[PDB]
Symmetry: C3
């Protein structure tokens, strides 16, 4: 059979774990149907270093939030995140992806 694929976007949101609730609140408010969080990251930015812990998930961690969302949501989400990254460390990467079940993401 033909396995049909559909267009979606995937956001990768990298920021300090201390702001996880603000971020996931924003995602929920915008109507994102799910998200995945990768913790204990390291990284280098324009100003500071984040050393990933070698034993546990500490509170002052760097995290990445992965969120697959319909095209129509990208614009409003970035506007929502605009004041945040205007104020805080981190980045947003927008990807084009394909998924098998459009309804799962709306």
């Amino acid at each position: 059979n033909a396995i049909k694929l559909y267009p979606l976007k995937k956001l990768e949101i990298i920021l300090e774990g201390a702001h996880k609730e603000f971020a996931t609140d924003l995602l929920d408010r915008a109507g994102v149907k799910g998200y995945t969080i990768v913790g204990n990251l390291s990284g280098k930015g324009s100003h500071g270093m984040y050393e990933g812990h070698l034993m546990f998930n500490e509170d002052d961690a760097l995290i990445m939030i992965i969120a697959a969302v319909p095209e129509e949501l990208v614009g409003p989400l970035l506007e929502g995140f605009q004041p945040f990254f205007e104020a805080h460390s981190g980045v947003v990467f927008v990807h084009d992806i394909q998924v098998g079940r459009p309804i799962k993401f709306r």
Copy 2:
């Protein structure tokens, strides 16, 4: 100067309990490698998946595969995600070494 070749990349997010089923399917289809990211949390349509503080309840499998494999792989994963939690993301990527992946 440095030539690139087209490939597809799958991100397969699912419960750690099913790691072997997932990797068996990738292997059977002839996937030459994959990467498993542990220590995840997440929110789904019905529940929260809380990551451990130190084992891996939710995982993400990254698998770069030739285009010809995507169909067969999705067929393999269809009955699974029909019954179980998780998602598959298909990406277009580029790589430098085509034979490393087929």
Copy 3:
């Protein structure tokens, strides 16, 4: 909110060579990077079993680097001799960002 085209590298390699990789990224003028640790995987020759990994040198990492298109060629050239002799892979993605100046 305008979006702009960029590339994103996913660089998977052994943790023992992390400094080599990050030095190369820094030297080439890459403005930032993010490292995902504690990875396991299956490679061309062997299995990298996470439970069998105990040192940071033996573990796999994934370095995520968002970079302008013009930087990709020279970066892959720098990594070319490394991956001839060492394990790991590089995935090149198309992405979009909002603050192009942040990445140059």
